[PDB]
Ligand binder design. Structure first.
Ligand SMILES: *[C@@H]1O[C@H](CO)[C@@H](O[C@@H]2O[C@H](CO)[C@@H](O[C@@H]3O[C@H](CO[C@H]4O[C@H](CO)[C@@H](O)[C@H](O)[C@@H]4O)[C@@H](O)[C@H](O)[C@@H]3O)[C@H](O)[C@H]2NC(C)=O)[C@H](O)[C@H]1NC(C)=O
Ligand SMILES: *[C@@H]1O[C@H](CO)[C@@H](O[C@@H]2O[C@H](CO)[C@@H](O)[C@H](O)[C@H]2NC(C)=O)[C@H](O)[C@H]1NC(C)=O
Ligand SMILES: CC(=O)N[C@@H]1[C@@H](O)[C@H](O)[C@@H](CO)O[C@H]1O
Ligand SMILES: CC(=O)N[C@@H]1[C@@H](O)[C@H](O)[C@@H](CO)O[C@H]1O
Ligand SMILES: OC[C@H]1O[C@H](O)[C@@H](O)[C@@H](O)[C@@H]1O
Ligand SMILES: [Cl-]
Ligand SMILES: [Cu+2]
Ligand SMILES: [Cu+2]
Ligand SMILES: [Cu+2]
Ligand SMILES: [Cu+2]
Ligand SMILES: [K+]
Ligand SMILES: [Zn+2]
Ligand SMILES: [Zn+2]
Ligand SMILES: [Zn+2]
Ligand SMILES: [Zn+2]
Ligand SMILES: [Zn+2]
Ligand SMILES: [Zn+2]
Ligand SMILES: [Zn+2]
Ligand SMILES: [Zn+2]
Length: 550
């Protein structure tokens, strides 16, 4: 109705129908090695063109988006994933090193061409080792229909945990120990204050200004390394209007529990007394180890000033900030109602465990029997191009086949440990059938199949040690998208340690998107770089910084 998607609305099946705008958006990203003082302490970061939040990819529903990525670092390769982007018959643009491409080496490039076949909020980031968490990420905002109206779109709001030592600096101590990583702090959209060792304050807090009476869209993204956050705005109400790329029936709440890799679209109404209010992102202590959960805040400033002054507002009393949880299954109802259709589906189960390896012990996460051990130098797609009808997978490849077109897969991702994990499926919106605590008993647990929640990242929740630990999440998806899709824990360190598996989906029909050149050119350049730079060689052993390959 005077929109760039005229002739479609909130009720259009975006899995089947894509607006043809014939418009190409085009971005040039130089991935750089540098330095940044995000809370006023200097430390190394790796960045998209020098900015933290990387610049945002903006598109309208239905557009083609073309991201020219160039590696201008000296000691990392790169590969860039557009999280939540479906890549329908476009697998090779999904940017998972060791699956869909070789890593792009310094001074080489890779042009990502993908279609905007969803609308909503997400982000792109590296899928190359720990790099997304060095800062190689930025938002994706695809304009489209909304399930509630608002007045102003404030864009992305990123929530990270943060340390003054590098995620790569801490990696080796993470692997050699069974306790979680420790983070000093957090940032909201890349800012926070910081104070130590003098009582001097450095950096600054996030701030936005609401004009009274106005309705704002905020698009939350948990971009953190190892934190599940609960987000709120003192005295204000939040109207959840979408989960990941899927718009839901609006509903209000005090706080948004937000898992790593997840997005929530939020409408907030300047309907409180024009004053100053805490914006809070609080680490959930069951699965978050932060030194500063009280102090990851930002200022909501109402136009009717009170400038330069802190807020004095009280946090919503909503219970503890302990357990790491998703909105419940019934709270997340997709506006496009589609259901799970699991009749006669390939049933599958994957255990999640945390096991030691080698004489040092390195403690590795392990998904469906093995910790992933694949090869930058030899991505799956090369394997399947060299051998079209390959069936001899190696267990440490974490293959789960779905070779029959349009057949569903109902997967159980389950654990015995009192440790919860965000689980993200590439190439798909999965249908979230069950979610719970303790062990999963297919007789006692009732699968929601009628218009269940639909998204790309959801928690495998876990019970606390006093309640016996353990947990499971159940997902289902049709084989509707040929390609090799990573399925994995969205926690950085876990996925690098092997907490990842690969859907080898519709293998026969890889020729439907596969380009020899797009593959070879990059792999040759990466091979070229490995001959001269020690960092071109994937460390895969057990006395150093292990990389599963993704
Ligand atoms: C968190 O950080 C993000 C990145 O640092 C912030 O992203 C910004 O989000 C807003 C909301 O979508 C965008 O606003 C738009 O800007 C584009 C481009 O604007 C520029 O070019 C036009 C001409 O094409 C010019 O007229 C403008 O003055 C600008 O020079 C517009 O086309 C859109 O219609 C819209 O106005 C920003 O572009 C976006 N920036 C980046 C770098 O992605 C985000 O705001 C931060 N979140 C909060 C809450 O602060
Ligand atoms: C970013 O730049 C830094 C500084 O040049 C790189 O780190 C150094 O790495 C070399 C090679 O391993 C070492 O010999 C130096 O001692 C390091 N110096 C410091 C200050 O750490 C780093 O590898 C680069 N990162 C990339 C290319 O992604
Ligand atoms: C997998 C890989 O090569 N990662 C490296 C990491 O070891 C190094 O510490 C970092 C320095 O910025 O650059 C990158
Ligand atoms: C080809 C290769 O060496 N694969 C590695 C193996 O060497 C290593 O011992 C193991 C431990 O995670 O992981 C895998
Ligand atoms: O363990 C890998 C690496 O970790 C650190 C140091 O103790 C190094 O000497 C060692 O090689
Ligand atoms: Cl842990
Ligand atoms: Cu992601
Ligand atoms: Cu993804
Ligand atoms: Cu995990
Ligand atoms: Cu991923
Ligand atoms: K070679
Ligand atoms: Zn819009
Ligand atoms: Zn961990
Ligand atoms: Zn004014
Ligand atoms: Zn003011
Ligand atoms: Zn059916
Ligand atoms: Zn063969
Ligand atoms: Zn139904
Ligand atoms: Zn060559």
């Amino acid at each position: 109705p005077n929109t760039p998607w005229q002739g479609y609305d909130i009720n259009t099946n975006y899995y089947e129908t894509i607006p043809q705008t014939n418009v190409v958006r085009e971005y040039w990203f130089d991935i750089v090695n540098t330095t940044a003082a995000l809370d006023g302490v200097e430390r190394p970061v790796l960045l998209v063109n020098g900015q933290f939040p990387g610049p945002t990819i903006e598109a309208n529903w239905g557009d083609t988006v073309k991201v020219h990525v160039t590696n201008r670092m000296e000691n990392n390769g790169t590969a860039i994933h557009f999280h939540g982007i479906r890549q329908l018959y476009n697998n090779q643009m999904d940017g998972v090193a060791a699956l869909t491409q070789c890593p792009v080496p310094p001074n080489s490039s890779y042009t990502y061409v993908w279609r905007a076949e969803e609308y909503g909020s997400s982000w792109y980031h590296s899928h190359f080792s720990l790099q997304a968490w060095e800062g190689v990420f930025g938002g994706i905002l695809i304009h489209g229909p909304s399930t509630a109206e608002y007045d102003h779109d404030l864009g992305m709001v990123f929530l990270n945990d943060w340390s003054h030592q590098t995620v790569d600096e801490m990696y080796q101590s993470v692997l050699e120990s069974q306790n979680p990583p420790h983070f000093q702090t957090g940032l909201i959209n890349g800012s926070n204050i910081w104070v130590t060792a003098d009582n001097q304050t450095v950096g600054r807090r996030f701030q936005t200004e609401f004009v009274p009476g106005q309705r704002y869209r905020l698009r939350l993204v948990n971009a953190a390394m190892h934190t599940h956050f609960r987000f709120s705005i003192d005295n204000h109400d939040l109207t959840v209007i979408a989960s990941d790329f899927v718009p839901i029936v609006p509903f209000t709440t005090n706080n948004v529990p937000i898992g790593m890799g997840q997005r929530y679209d939020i409408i907030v109404t300047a309907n409180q007394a024009p004053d100053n209010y805490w914006i809070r992102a609080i680490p959930q202590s069951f699965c978050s180890d932060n030194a500063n959960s009280d102090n990851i805040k930002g200022v909501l400033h109402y136009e009717g000033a009170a400038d330069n002054s802190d807020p004095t507002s009280t946090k919503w009393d909503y219970g503890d900030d302990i357990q790491c949880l998703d909105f419940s299954l019934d709270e997340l109802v997709p506006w496009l109602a589609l259901d799970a259709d699991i009749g006669g589906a390939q049933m599958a189960e994957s255990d999640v465990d945390f096991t030691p390896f080698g004489d040092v012990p390195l403690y590795l996460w392990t998904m469906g029997g093995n910790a992933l051990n694949i090869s930058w130098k030899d991505p799956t797609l090369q394997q399947t191009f060299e051998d079209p009808d390959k069936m001899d997978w190696k267990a440490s490849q974490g293959v789960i086949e779905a070779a029959i077109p349009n057949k569903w897969t109902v997967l159980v991702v389950q654990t015995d440990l009192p440790v919860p994990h965000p689980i993200h499926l590439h190439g798909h919106d999965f249908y979230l059938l069950a979610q719970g605590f303790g062990q999963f008993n297919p007789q006692n647990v009732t699968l929601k199949t009628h218009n269940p929640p639909r998204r790309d990242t959801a928690l495998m929740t876990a019970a606390t040690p006093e309640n016996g630990g353990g947990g499971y999440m159940v997902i289902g998806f049709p084989a509707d998208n040929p390609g090799v899709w990573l399925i994995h824990c969205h926690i950085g360190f876990h996925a690098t340690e092997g907490f990842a598996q690969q859907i080898v989906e519709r293998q026969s029909e890889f020729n439907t998107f596969f380009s020899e050149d797009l593959l070879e050119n990059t792999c040759d350049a990466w091979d070229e770089y490995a001959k001269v730079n020690p960092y071109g060689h994937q460390y895969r052993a057990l006395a150093g910084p292990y990389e599963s390959g993704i």
